[PDB]
Amino acid sequence: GAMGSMERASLIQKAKLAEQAERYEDMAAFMKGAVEKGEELSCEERNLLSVAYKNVVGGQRAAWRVLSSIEQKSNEEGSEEKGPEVREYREKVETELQGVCDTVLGLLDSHLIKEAGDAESRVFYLKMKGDYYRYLAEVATGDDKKRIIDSARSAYQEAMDISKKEMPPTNPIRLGLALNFSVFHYEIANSPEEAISLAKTTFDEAMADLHTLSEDSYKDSTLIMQLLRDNLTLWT
């Protein structure tokens, strides 16, 4: 690792600096280096890791979607043959995206998940595992597409099972997990009814638990609840 000679604390400090500078590729590289020190991550560190790679892959996904749309248009009946270039460049971005997802999944498998025993860490990492298999599923087309989808489903399901046993319904990790698993159902699994049911049940169970919360926790939970409602409005 190019970060192997840097102190763990220095890597975390630089990840925070990279975030302020909106240098998310650097942020992800720093946080990868921190993970590879082998120690468990704190709550703040887990979120630094997630923010970094979410921003990197989010940009890749946005670019892939633009290029896929151009490619599909170039292949419609009536278009001018524009050569292999659009496909080639879409493939290049796709391969880079898959590489980032494989990197994150590799960090989770070696060895973040196996050492994560507390609900807040284990659910967080299993949600990430579901998320990065979901991004792989968004671009998958071959012999392994079904297996990628099932890997996302399985990770999300284990996270859900733990979250329902160990966290209150307003816990923001539980809410964000359900938000994303609901999107998985809608966009990946072709299961819009499951997506809607999950979002609605999650929202209602959180609503009924808000009375237990401080003002700051209320803000955290209701922000994610609004995203659930936003998706339900999109879908119904």
């Binding site: 938000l179 994303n180 999107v183 994610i224 936003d230 998706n231 999109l234």
Partner: peptide, 5 residues
Amino acid sequence: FPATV
């Protein structure tokens, strides 16, 4: 595109 976090 739907919201995720």
